[PDB]
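Honest question from a wet-lab person: if I give you the sequences of every part of a complex, can you actually get the arrangement of the whole thing, not just the pieces? Trying it with mine:
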Amino acid sequence: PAAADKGGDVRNLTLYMEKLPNGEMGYGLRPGEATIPGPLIELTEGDTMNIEVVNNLDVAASLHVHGLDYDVASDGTKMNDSVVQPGERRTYVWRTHAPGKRHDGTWEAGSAGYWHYHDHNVGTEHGTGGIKKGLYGPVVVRRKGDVLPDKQFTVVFNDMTINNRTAPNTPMFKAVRGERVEFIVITHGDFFHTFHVHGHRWVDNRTGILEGPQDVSRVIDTKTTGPADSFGFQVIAGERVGAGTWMYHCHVQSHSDMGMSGVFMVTEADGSVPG
Amino acid sequence: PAAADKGGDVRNLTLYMEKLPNGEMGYGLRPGEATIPGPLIELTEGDTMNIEVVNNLDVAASLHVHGLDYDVASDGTKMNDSVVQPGERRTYVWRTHAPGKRHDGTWEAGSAGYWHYHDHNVGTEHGTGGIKKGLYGPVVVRRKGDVLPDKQFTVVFNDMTINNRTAPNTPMFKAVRGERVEFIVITHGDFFHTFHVHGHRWVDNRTGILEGPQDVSRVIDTKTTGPADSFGFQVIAGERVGAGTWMYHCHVQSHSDMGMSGVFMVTEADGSVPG
Amino acid sequence: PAAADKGGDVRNLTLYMEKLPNGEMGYGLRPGEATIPGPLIELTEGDTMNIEVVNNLDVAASLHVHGLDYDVASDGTKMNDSVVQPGERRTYVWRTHAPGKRHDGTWEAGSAGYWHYHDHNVGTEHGTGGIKKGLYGPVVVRRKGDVLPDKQFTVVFNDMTINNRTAPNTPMFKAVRGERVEFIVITHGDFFHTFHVHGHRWVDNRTGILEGPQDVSRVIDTKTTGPADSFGFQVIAGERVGAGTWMYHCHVQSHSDMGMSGVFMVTEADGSVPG
Ligand SMILES: [Cu+2]
Ligand SMILES: [Cu+2]
Ligand SMILES: [Cu+2]
Ligand SMILES: [Cu+2]
Ligand SMILES: [Cu+2]
Ligand SMILES: [Cu+2]
Ligand SMILES: [Cu+2]
Ligand SMILES: [Cu+2]
Ligand SMILES: [Cu+2]
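Yes, you can. This is the full assembly:
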């Protein structure tokens, strides 16, 4: 299995905050290529990201990240003077660290995990407006040695939507049976959800993956998730269960009845799927 | 104490889906013996369950399970043609597995845990009407060597009820001080709850029991649980606290004031209780 | 840093239940010195607390505790005849224990953790009115050898407030960069929240501190919390991120927009802060 090498690179990135059709807003890697969710930023403990943010919106907006090391200047809040005016640009710096023992003999936990970034200034000083309209994206921080996936899918429960869509227009994630698949699950907005995926399960720990025989973590297939929670996991697609149309949905009954569901399509190597 | 043996047996079961008084629906081991919750199904990692489901309801209904290994033909969904017409029957198959190393050296987590089954077709294609009316039940999968209880009690928070009842008609669970009692807690429907039991506590891990001196798990007596969450634990009834009428309830205040509570009655050997 | 000694001491405390301005109620260490939250109670596994409760309210009221060992006489409920009439007093006893093996070879988990106490009789038999008006407070139980903090901050999400207040009147917690600070987070009432603090993160286990290399727990900066949930953690203030005005808030967007936020102000040694 492919595994993450040691971290420690300084990386540069540019994000464009752009208007999208029908009043939505998105981050993109190039102008006119903004998506909801925004691009996935992946790094390894020790890496630094210098992210230039270009605001092509009509109102001041920002970039706030969960979990990583940043100083108040990269807070993403008006309060700490960390927002971007229309037509301007600003650099936000994200640092990360490996686990280590402090001089006092206590353990500092590393940066690795499933995280996210989003706007903190549109609509309100908590970014309620920007989050609603699509300004959110995933961040994966690896630890050295972490197993890497073949595919990555991001599910954002944004109020009563999946990635701002409802069924049947929610994303379908396709993989081949046996592929290692990574899910990143983020919740935003005003409501609490339960993420459930048919035919698959994962370990309720940092990686979603059993670490070894002394791992006492619950194995689950449903997880409560509320605004700005983030978690992730990896499955072998179709393991023990075969190819097929596997629903992923919020299991709150009114929510799934109102369209908070989508398809995880696990196919055979030739692309066929039962049904 | 009694501990679960090595699994790997093929077991057969028949469930009947039956109308109950006042528009309710339950699963039963025999016609006319349907209960809410349905019968507890217990197996050990490696065991296979072949479950014949007889539908004596007036609408098509199904059986969907969390956590266990099943193919799309036992998905319990109309989408994968996995439902039972009124007056017909259909066999669903649940497989389970123990933990193990894959070829690529990674670890597959075992099936063991606190799980559940429910309808996925009555009312809506997510089972909203069937779940509402009582079509749900607990599943327990053991790992070999897991400690076994003397009693098992199932608590389902279904919307604003416990097992479709409200106080004072919610179930009283009875045990003698010192007995090993196992609780299985499932939530269904539209709302989020906090399960709490007076005078007792457990470990927030797979078994609810401390695995050993290495186990870093939180020790809790309250837990958030949302639609289709399932967990469970064992306590020694009355340990360190004595016999008594020990409340269990949802700790959301409006919910407890509206009848979401019941009694865990821990008696002396002679059946007496303080008060 | 400082580490907790072994427990096994018997401690005595008096709490006064007192009317507060504008219809609020609080627990206090002296008459006229009640606070919301009530005073923090800290002990070590094996310690016993004898708490004399003086009810100076106009209605019968009580003391109910999570997590610790108590018999039904200290249950705090009317049903177990465990309340205090106006103008009277009553002693509640809390015991605790260390982990250990029972005779049957199973592990009994210890009492250590982040816990809380509240009224269980004012307004309703579940203390709904007493909890609403301010009758709650934190409890910290240590394990022998636990790292001890320099400061303790208690955040109680009580319905749509923090310690019964909204911004700008929510508590400001101050510490110097490098100081070891402890947060205790408790939710009460009718709603679910997600606690988030900018610039800081912790380990989702008993202590909030990484135990060592084998600790598989999710490292997080956001956590769902519902009524009577309690957790806690320690951080090194400003670690990797510097001094600053670091927001803590519920991340439910309407809740934060409606005042569920406050300031964690990390200063330099001389009291200065950026901004
Ligand atoms: Cu914020
Ligand atoms: Cu939902
Ligand atoms: Cu955020
Ligand atoms: Cu489903
Ligand atoms: Cu509830
Ligand atoms: Cu389900
Ligand atoms: Cu209670
Ligand atoms: Cu909130
Ligand atoms: Cu309580």
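Two things worth pointing out. Chain A has two domains: 10-142, 151-267. The pocket of copper (II) ion (ligand 6) is lined by residues A 251; B 64, 66, 118, 228 (CB under 6 Å).
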